[PDB]
């Protein structure tokens, strides 16, 4: 029976990988950072309160210019906000009201959304007839589409609940690369600054590092005990943080292939919906189910502040590319800008 | 007032967008949203045809009431990842076939179809997002049940049954066993129908149940009940 032989070989290789990871840890991050200045206390005040959604807000995305927003709600409408003046630029009606993700193109030309409809829809923002149309409807997934990020104006990457991540070509409307290997529903995506790698977060408590132009998994990251709901790279591209339902954030290193730090508190027993780093990589903002967000110290593992003001679950986070503002979306149909 | 002409025009555009958003909000708030479930393929297609990829929606109007129905079939994923999207539905329509107490799912050679339906009903009716959501229970294929009960007793599916092997008592026992799984009796009500009627009577039952649910919701909101 070759099944037992191959299972034993896989288990032995897992032991070898674990031994290599353990022999590579000589000092911990808490043993190096203990002799630096504390972050202090972070008092962030609400400046804007975007109004107009009449249902739960499930996702938002900032623009590259750090001024425009896009928000998706169960009303079945996408709203583009001018954060400086609280103005509404566009109100895009959706054919399916069960939207669960949104994205804004880096060039400011396209807006993508998707959800329970199994379809990723691309919207053309700048047209000669003055309205917003649907450019392509990308079909091919067999489960709810949970995340979508733009590589450029022509390539998009999507994650779905069919244990599969895909890379599309918008012009031809086809799927270029298929990423397989997850044993559970892929929940979160985050793209590298160089737009060459990306990580996935699934319900099997794992994070995998992918190559965009190779379709090959590089490394697998474990350590969580529950479903991973959020993920985001460190700004330089050599680390990332993961959010899960076990009321804990992690920090992983791509070069050491190991877990760096664990963010957890005794009073926190609620799951985490969103994570985001600051511009410098020192503050780790995390959105929790206890209706408020906690600002962490990415190097000292100490809570720095609390952003309260939401009457329901905080669903989506976001930090501007210049680090000026943080935007929080909640199930109470509100967005808030903090500084 | 410290605003350019283009700034004022943008403000006016935003206000028009807000007005359209409101109008859509009050237009969609007077729509009944129903979530249709059911184990396997028992009577879902039949009832959809009676009142005619991923999520499938069917629209129909009955007596100046727009009904918005959702079929979550073929969504072979984790249920606890998208079941909170339907937290605000008016009611849940549940379909159970009476002619599967003698059947096996063919995936597990020992599990009964009726017990699988009961387990799924227990999972849905006691979900924490559906604490105050009423359930409309549809029991299909009563003629098949009547013509199969005389050759096979109900004791094979319910070994504790100690009643007469006739149609009415067995149907009542099945209904009682389904209704006894409700652990939130103080905040939700289960409406039961025997729906093997080719006539246009099932949609009337749905209308009556939705009207009763709306009345109870309004009474609770006002505070009388």
């Amino acid at each position: 029976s070759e099944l037992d032989q191959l299972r034993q070989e896989a288990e032995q290789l897992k032991n070898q990988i674990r031994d290599a990871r353990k022999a590579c840890a000589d000092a911990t991050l808490s043993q190096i950072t203990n002799n630096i200045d504390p972050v202090g206390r972070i008092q962030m005040r609400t400046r804007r309160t975007l109004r107009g959604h009449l249902a739960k807000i499930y996702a938002m995305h900032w623009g590259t210019d750090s001024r425009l927003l896009v928000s998706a709600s169960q009303d079945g409408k996408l709203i583009i906000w001018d954060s400086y003046t609280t103005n509404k630029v566009h109100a895009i009606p959706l054919r399916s009201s069960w939207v669960m993700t949104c994205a804004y193109a880096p060039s400011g030309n396209y807006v993508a959304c998707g959800g329970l409809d199994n379809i990723c829809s691309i919207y053309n923002l700048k047209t000669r007839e003055g309205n917003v149309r649907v450019s392509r409807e990308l079909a091919g997934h067999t489960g709810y589409l949970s995340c979508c990020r733009f590589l450029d104006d022509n390539q998009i990457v999507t994650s779905s609940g069919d244990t599969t991540c895909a890379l599309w070509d918008i012009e031809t409307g086809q799927q270029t690369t298929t990423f397989t290997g997850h044993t559970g529903d892929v929940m979160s995506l985050s793209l590298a600054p160089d737009t060459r790698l990306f990580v996935s977060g699934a319900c099997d408590a794992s994070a995998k590092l992918w190559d965009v132009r190779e379709g090959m998994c590089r490394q697998t990251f474990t350590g969580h005990e529950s479903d991973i709901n959020a993920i985001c790279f460190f700004p330089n591209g050599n680390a990332f943080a993961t959010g899960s339902d076990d009321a804990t954030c992690r920090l992983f290193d791509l070069r050491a292939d190991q877990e760096l730090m664990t963010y957890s508190h005794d009073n926190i027993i609620c799951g985490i919906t969103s994570v985001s780093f600051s511009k410098s990589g020192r503050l780790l903002l995390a959105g929790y189910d206890d209706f408020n967000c906690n600002v962490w110290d990415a190097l000292k593992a100490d809570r720095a502040g609390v952003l309260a003001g939401h009457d329901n679950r905080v669903s989506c986070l976001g930090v501007t590319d210049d680090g000026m503002a943080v935007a929080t979306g909640s199930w109470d149909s509100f967005l808030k800008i903090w500084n | 007032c410290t605003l350019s002409a283009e700034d004022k025009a943008a403000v006016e555009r935003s206000k028009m967008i807000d007005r359209n958003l409101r109008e859509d909000g009050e237009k969609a708030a007077r729509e009944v949203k129903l979530l249709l479930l059911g184990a396997g393929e028992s009577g879902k297609n039949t009832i959809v045809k009676q009142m005619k990829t991923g999520i499938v929606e069917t629209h129909f109007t009955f007596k100046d009431l727009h009904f918005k129905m959702f079929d979550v079939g073929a969504q072979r994923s984790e249920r606890k990842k998208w079941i909170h999207c339907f937290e605000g539905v008016t009611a849940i329509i549940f379909c159970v076939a009476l002619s599967d107490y003698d059947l096996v799912l063919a995936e597990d050679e020992e599990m009964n179809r009726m017990h699988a339906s009961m387990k799924l009903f227990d999972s849905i009716c006691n979900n924490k997002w559906f604490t105050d959501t009423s359930i409309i229970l549809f029991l299909n294929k009563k003629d098949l049940f009547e013509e199969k009960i005389k050759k096979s007793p109900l004791t094979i599916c319910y070994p504790e049954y100690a009643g007469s092997n006739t149609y009415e008592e067995a149907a009542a026992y099945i209904q009682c066993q389904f209704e006894d799984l409700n652990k939130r009796k103080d905040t939700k009500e289960i409406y039961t129908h025997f729906t093997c009627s080719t006539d246009t009577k099932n949609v009337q039952f749905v209308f009556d149940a939705v009207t009763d649910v709306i009345i109870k919701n309004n009474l609770k909101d006002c505070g009388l009940f």
Partner: single-chain antibody
Amino acid sequence: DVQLVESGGGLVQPGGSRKLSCSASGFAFSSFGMHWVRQAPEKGLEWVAYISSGSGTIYYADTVKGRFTISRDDPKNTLFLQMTSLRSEDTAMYYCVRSIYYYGSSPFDFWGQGTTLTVSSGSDIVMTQATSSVPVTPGESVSISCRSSKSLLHSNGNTYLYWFLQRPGQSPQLLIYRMSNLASGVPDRFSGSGSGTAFTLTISRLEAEDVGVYYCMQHLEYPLTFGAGTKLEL
């Protein structure tokens, strides 16, 4: 494609009344604001009226108040200009101009073909283009200067100055919409720069298709004023 065909002109006696119709085909007429710009045979662009989306805001020039009425028909996609008490100074060619307004928009991006109307028998911002005709050889750079009597650098950071080109026997088209931004469909050879009350339009690598008259317009505050126009020759 996008079109705006005007009708209702002709020869009219003084003191009469006429209506000009602007039929819109190819775009969302409800979401676009509309203007009326007239050009007398003396080669000058003069603003007339404006109606916003939803018919909420209506503006007129000081020389047409009480005589001209502007309205729109959204279901029929038509714009009307009701004219009363016409004088000999209303002899011009009237244009229907499309405009939208939001963050990053491009107002005045389309102009209709226009209609000809003939009649027989201040706090406004003033811009001047001191050069009326610049002879030039193809292949060399051209600089066009337009100065303003008031600073256009609003406190929000935007400078509201626009550039237009009118080829012989055609309709004006947009080149630069806020002092630096190229319009959609124009070559990269056109570059605009300036600050305060000094503005320059640079035409690098000039070709024979760029011959025409160039106009500068402000959109800081109503009424919207134009310039006399600099004409490139040869």
